Each structure stands twice: as C-alpha cells, then as structure tokens.
Ligand binder design. Structure first.
Ligand code: GDP
Ligand code: MG
Length: 202
C-alpha cells in the first residue's frame, strides 16, 4: 500500500504570516526538508479522515518573495494551493490577482483557497465585502488567525473534499498544534461570522 500525497504551494507577499501558519502543525515542522536551490522548506502535514490518512506536502518559501517573484520550479506539478494576505495591510490584498495569475499560468485548473490572516488584531482594514470579487473568480475564502489557531483546519478540509470528490469527508481527530500565543476575542469572532453571512447571502 502506497501513500495518498498532494503537493500544495503556499504563496503570498512577505510579512503576511505564511511561515507562522505552516509551523502550527508541530510534526510537519519537526520532519521538514530544506531544499536550497528551490528556495523552499517542505512540510509533511498529515491529516486523519473517516476514509483514512492523507498527506499534504506544504511548500513554504525561504523569503525570496520580498525581493522578487518565484520561479516556475516552485509551481510545477502542484495539485492544490493557498494564497495568503494580511487583513491590516491593503497592499498585501491588492497583490492577490498577480499571485492567482502565476498559479493559473503554470498549473491551470487546480482547487485554490484564499486566506485572510491576522484577524485577532482589533483595527482591521480589509473586510468581508472586499472578498466578493475573488469568490466570483472561483476562489474559496476563510478568515484565519495563525497565532491563536482560529480556523486552522478549514482550508485543509475544503481542499481534501474537492480532491477526493466527497462532500461528506470528515477529520476524525485533530493534529497536535502549537499552543496559542494570543487569545482570539469571542466578540470579534461572532461579528466577523455575521459579516461573511451578510456579504454572501444578501
Ligand atoms: N498577531 C499576529 N501576528 C501575526 C500573525 N501571523 C503573522 N504575524 C506576524 O507577522 C510577521 C511575519 O510573519 P512570518 O511568519 O515571517 O510571515 P511570512 O514572511 O509571510 O512568512 C511576524 O512578526 C509575525 O509574528 C497572526 O496570526 N497574528
Ligand atoms: Mg516566510
């Protein structure tokens, strides 16, 4: 018996929280592989479903997105992807179309998730109404906080359901995660859940 394994590319501007987000899955960080000529660290994030074990091999940069773009070797062969931005920084959000363009050019029709990070910070700039454009382009969206573990499993459970072709797939136990470094206020989570429903119903 082989192993069900998927290449996932994690892309987005420098300073958005990619490396902090991938590092929450503790065993993936313990067993990572550094490849210097690609400019990447590959993290084996294993998840446990109702039909069995799955592995997402997550590609995280070495910081080369701050002074340029990524080569075609980073993207080639991906089976899925996560594009991240920071919700307190608008310039990170306005560069999302160009990240989506590179994934489309090299990979064509793969399932892609858009993540808005740092939702624990009180003064938020980019809200739920500005995400509607990307939903009409066929991206899936989640509000994320890497430091408190808020919605960590969401992007991985949607991508597993798409790849396997099963809308009733579930995770039967959670992976060991790095203890929260900040508290996600419960009044801010209740308000942001309401903003998203308003925007995508009405
Ligand atoms: N409060 C808070 N700070 C965050 C969060 N995610 C990232 N940061 C901060 O963002 C900065 C950049 O983080 P890093 O993981 O290196 O991001 P990257 O360059 O995109 O890989 C650091 O100072 C982090 O501590 C988040 O969930 N909450
Ligand atoms: Mg990084």
């Amino acid at each position: 018996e082989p192993q069900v394994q998927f290449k996932l590319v994690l892309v987005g501007d420098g300073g958005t929280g990619k490396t902090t987000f991938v590092k929450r899955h503790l065993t993936g960080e313990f067993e990572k592989k550094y490849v210097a000529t690609l400019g990447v660290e590959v993290h084996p994030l294993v998840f446990h479903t109702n039909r069995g074990p799955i592995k997402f091999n997550v590609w995280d940069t070495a910081g080369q997105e701050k002074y340029g773009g990524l080569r075609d070797g980073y993207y080639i062969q991906a089976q899925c992807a996560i594009i991240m931005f920071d919700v307190t920084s608008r310039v990170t959000y306005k560069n999302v179309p160009n990240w989506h363009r590179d994934l489309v050019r090299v990979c064509e029709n793969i399932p892609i998730v858009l993540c808005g990070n740092k939702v624990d910070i009180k003064d938020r700039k980019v809200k739920a109404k500005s995400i509607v454009f990307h939903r009409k382009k066929n991206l899936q969206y989640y509000d994320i906080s890497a430091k408190s573990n808020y919605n960590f499993e969401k992007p991985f459970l949607w991508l597993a359901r798409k790849l396997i072709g099963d809308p009733n797939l579930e995770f039967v136990a959670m992976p060991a995660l790095a203890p929260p470094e900040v508290v996600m206020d419960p009044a801010l989570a209740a308000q942001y859940e309401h903003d998203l429903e308003v925007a995508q119903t009405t």
